[PDB]
Amino acid sequence: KISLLPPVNFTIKVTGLAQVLLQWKPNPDQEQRNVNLEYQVKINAPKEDDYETRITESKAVTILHKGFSASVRTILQNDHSLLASSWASAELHAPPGSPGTSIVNLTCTTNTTEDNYSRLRSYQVSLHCTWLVGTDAPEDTQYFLYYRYGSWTEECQEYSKDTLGRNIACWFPRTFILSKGRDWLAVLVNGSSKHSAIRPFDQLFALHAIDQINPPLNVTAEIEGTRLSIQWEKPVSAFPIHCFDYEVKIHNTRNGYLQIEKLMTNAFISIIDDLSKYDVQVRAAVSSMCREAGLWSEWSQPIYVGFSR
């Protein structure tokens, strides 16, 4: 019967925007090349997490404005037992700054658009951010926003300010964000003043949670006698034709009857009443086959059909 020995020289380095590198070394006394002892890492704060690794380092993505706390230990898992050393721990102190100076209510929206003319036929993502000034933030502070997607990091330059000159919004017409992206967009906003020091704020956004899908265009509807035909084009997006869920709303303006069709197609042909005026709208979302559930687009601006006479 014997036990394990804890790792040493446990460090935590800020390598990037919401990006940390955890490093440590194997305990000198323990066995050298026992290839099936590994390391367990536990994140104690801000959010509790737990995972294994076999390397003496670990890169991780997490917010850093609330500080950071991690523990690492040596483990050996038989499938009857788990053997564990004591924890070695390390921390990153919460960034300096008086209370309430930090930005509140950060909101971010991405949108897919196209170029212009024959430069290349592709898609740009635009990023729009808004927020409120810190409540007791000294009237002098200026706020600055950075974002990181993948390897790319940028600072904004097109700001919208309030009445006392402070940045409360940001506009990126062109960005490094992938239109079909799965990765996490990291946004940091720090600030500066002559008096007090300002608490930086930062957030992690999954693209599917903030991608503002565009509305379907050229919604066309016609009634020929008893036959109703609705067509519409796939919205402006990098995701192809077969990746969209559609909801077609057919509203009877006379009696308020509301017919809603859910379909993955681009045209709906069916039967309807001659003698009522209808307004139709269509909205779209990205299918779960192509990406985890996200947001619905706005409704197409309504078109009218029936009672042509």
């Binding site: 890492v41 737990d50 995972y51 690794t53 380092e57 997490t62 999954a206």
Partner: peptide, 18 residues
Amino acid sequence: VDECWRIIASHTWFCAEE
């Protein structure tokens, strides 16, 4: 070298975007 990114808040791993 040769490890993925640990997405902490989502308890997940992330590698690439081929």
